Design a protein around this ligand. Structure first.
Ligand code: LVE
Ligand code: LVE
Lengths: 116, 115, 115, 116
């Protein structure tokens, strides 16, 4: 599993469950092509987005649907979504965890990149 | 000044100076229309982006060119840029500060919205 | 003003107003000696804590009374308080801003140190 | 394992390995009594600090030795250590993960609290 997304809720001190995530990859014509999508589990984690074969070098955008998350909980937040945009696999295959910590008016994101 | 952007460097403990910032407004066709731009000052702040007259309700994107900032310091960063996407609302308070705190493999953003 | 403390609320997107802040200096016997204190203003800022003459090199602790802040808002928080412990150094730049960004179960802190 | 500590490095995009952690508990006389200590593993995690029986209700301080971490890597950081101070188990036993994200002049900490 070369791309994993983990989301935490800083208000409740819990995993952020059922957060929708959409991943895009920049195509040859410079548009954002849909690449993979899913939702976080009870642990706040989203596994199984892609495969080693499919996750080639490119520029990827991970869009974490934070507004949809807060509004499903009945809260009006500030951001539409969090966007994490990065070049992947340009020195060979790596494993990427994109972690996000959410509050209604703030979020932080970090990447943990490992070499198998 | 209804919109201000402030950028900070978590590695050196300093304002992030001379960082390019581009603001876009979402158009009716869902594309991003250039709206305003500038570079952060010696304080890490970018003032004067827009006016109350121009800054109507809608969805805006603030793009912060973090990659060039880190590379000009000789540091290899993870992200292409940082993006902050939000709705401007007239029911809320009138002044928006979008603050960003930068590290090579991480960034955070908060909104401080006041009258 | 060699030391300023700024506190922000990540839940409401606002300055954190009327937050108690206590600063201590580490004494020769390793205890914490009261040094300065105050409450954040309407801007979330606390100015005037000390002077260049009083703020000598050494280890300081800034304690931010986050628990009372959240409870006054009717919110149950995780931490007793936030603590920031650091060394003041004359080799560095002269002005220290300790900024804190608060959520009920999380907080972050950065130092912005400038001339 | 009712108390776990996880530390990440925001400069390198990696777990923060070999970070020393000291846990204290406020005693009846209001002093900080040493409670447990350890160091983060190759995954950035520290398991095995305490037991369900030993981890009674109280006020705990988790001291993450961030300066020692950065100085062992040859970097001069701003903070002496990160301190996370919280009441535990006052509504019955819970499981606590204290997560920290480190940069030389900044850190963030979050708690993930679950009910077995
Ligand atoms: C990256 O892995 C994790 C991160 C965190 C964080 O709290 C967090 C902090 C800052 C950011 C930006 C993101 C995550 C907590 C858990 N955990 O409870 O297992 C993790 O596994
Ligand atoms: C030095 O002056 C400021 C510092 C910062 C921060 O350090 C901050 C932390 C987390 C984040 C995400 C952003 C910035 C914030 C504001 N501000 O918001 O007004 C300041 O005016």
């Amino acid at each position: 599993c070369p791309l994993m997304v983990k989301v935490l809720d800083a208000v409740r001190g819990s995993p952020a469950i059922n957060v929708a995530v959409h991943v895009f990859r920049k195509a040859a014509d410079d548009t954002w092509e849909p690449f993979a999508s899913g939702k976080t589990s009870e642990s706040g984690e989203l596994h199984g987005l892609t495969t080693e074969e499919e996750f080639v070098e490119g520029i990827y955008k991970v869009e974490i649907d934070t507004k949809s998350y807060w509004k499903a909980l009945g809260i009006s937040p500030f951001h539409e979504h969090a966007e994490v945009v990065f070049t992947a696999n340009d020195s060979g295959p790596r494993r990427y965890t994109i972690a996000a910590l959410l509050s209604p008016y703030s979020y932080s994101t970090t990447a943990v990149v490992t070499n198998p």
